[PDB]
C-alpha cells in the first residue's frame, strides 16, 4: 500500500496442501519494509 509517500510491504510465508485455492483458515501478515519512495502508483505487474 501507499500512504503519504511511504510504500508499505507486509508478508507471510505459510505451508499449504491445496493446489486449487487459497486456505480457508486464518493468518496475519507482518511488516517487511516501509520504503520512503515518494512516487505515484496506479498500476503494477508481477515479474516471472
Amino acid at each position: 500500500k501507499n500512504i503519504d509517500g511511504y510504500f508499505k510491504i507486509y508478508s507471510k510465508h505459510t505451508p499449504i496442501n491445496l493446489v486449487r485455492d487459497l486456505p480457508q483458515g486464518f493468518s496475519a501478515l507482518e511488516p517487511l519494509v516501509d520504503l520512503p519512495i515518494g512516487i505515484n502508483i496506479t498500476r503494477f505487474q508481477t515479474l516471472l
Binding site: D4, G5, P36, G38, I39, N40
Partner: peptide, 24 residues
C-alpha cells in the same frame, strides 16, 4: 537560509515547476 554567495550567477541551472511526492 539566504545563499546569494553560492547559488547566484542569473543562475538558470536552478529550476522550478501529494505530500512528499517527487513530481519530477
Amino acid at each position: 537560509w539566504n545563499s546569494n554567495n553560492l547559488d547566484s550567477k542569473g543562475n538558470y541551472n536552478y529550476l522550478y515547476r501529494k505530500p512528499f511526492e517527487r513530481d519530477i
